[PDB]
Amino acid sequence: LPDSVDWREKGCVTEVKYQGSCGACWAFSAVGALEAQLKLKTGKLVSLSAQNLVDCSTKKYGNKGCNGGFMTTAFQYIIDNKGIDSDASYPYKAMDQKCQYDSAYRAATCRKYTELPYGREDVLKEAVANKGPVSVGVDARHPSFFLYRSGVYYEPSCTQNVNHGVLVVGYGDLNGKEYWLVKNSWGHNFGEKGYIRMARNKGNHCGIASFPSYPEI
Numbered sequence: 091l092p093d094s095v096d097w098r099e100k101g102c103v104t105e106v107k108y109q110g111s112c113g114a115c116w117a118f119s120a121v122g123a124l125e126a127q128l129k130l131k132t133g134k135l136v137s138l139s140a141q142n143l144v145d146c147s148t149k150k151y152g153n154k155g156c157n158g159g160f161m162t163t164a165f166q167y168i169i170d171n172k173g174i175d176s177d178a179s180y181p182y183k184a185m186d187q188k189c190q191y192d193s194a195y196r197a198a199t200c201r202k203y204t205e206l207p208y209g210r211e212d213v214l215k216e217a218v219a220n221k222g223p224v225s226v227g228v229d230a231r232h233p234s235f236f237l238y239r240s241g242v243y244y245e246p247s248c249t250q251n252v253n254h255g256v257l258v259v260g261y262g263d264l265n266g267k268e269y270w271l272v273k274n275s276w277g278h279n280f281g282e283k284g285y286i287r288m289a290r291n292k293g294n295h296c297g298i299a300s301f302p303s304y305p306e307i
């Protein structure tokens with residue numbers, strides 16, 4: 091395994107998105123993971139429709155649109171639906187709408203997804219380095235997370251009780267401090283141009299390795 095990985099350098103990560111008033115973080119996390127696999131299997135990088143997940147992957151998948159959801163069941167919907175539209179063809183309106191999926195504008199599919207073992211940051215590391223960006227839930231309930239601007243985020247009061255779906259796009263070491271490179275969906279103004287480095291190998295800090303999963307085309 092390389093000492094550090096940054097899938098952005100590999101052109102496998104789309105622009106940072108802004109969820110606005112809608113709490114569809116779970117949706118952005120899922121599409122983000124899939125966008126990387128799409129680029130890896132076709133050479134083309136295209137933003138996938140988060141709105142498509144918000145409107146179509148609902149109750150049957152335990153998801154509540156702007157009120158929360160799961161990245162894994164999001165993947166399950168894409169498998170059952172046999173496709174997901176592109177962001178351009180099904181734009182993000184930041185609100186629950188009636189499902190408007192159109193197979194004519196399908197931009198990607200999903201064959202299956204993998205769930206990683208709870209709390210194993212070593213297995214997550216391997217997945218990030220060999221498979222690609224991984225969807226994860228983290229405890230982002232503390233003010234320190236919102237006010238973050240640079241460096242490696244460490245919050246002594248973080249728990250493994252996750253509530254926020256994000257994407258791990260890499261890992262590295264900064265001044266001896268190990269970290270996970272996390273892509274957020276709160277716009278370019280949050281943290282480092284929309285990204286945040288979280289303490290790595292510090293006993294599953296903020297539950298980042300509690301429930302990881304990634305899709306496969």
Ligand SMILES: *[C@H](CS(=O)(=O)c1ccccc1)[C@H](CCc1ccccc1)NC(=O)[C@H](CS(=O)(=O)CC1=C(C)NO[C@H]1C)NC(=O)N1CCOCC1
Binds near residue numbers: 114228
């Ligand atoms: C996005 C989170 S957020 O708005 O960025 C945020 C930021 C700072 C503090 C708190 C939240 C979703 C917000 C849901 C929401 C909206 C309005 C009011 C309350 C809550 N959160 C999620 O959708 C979250 C994703 S997760 O935690 O990764 C899902 C997983 C769980 C719960 N455990 O393992 C996971 C991977 N999911 C949920 O909150 N829920 C799942 C579906 O049922 C409802 C709750």
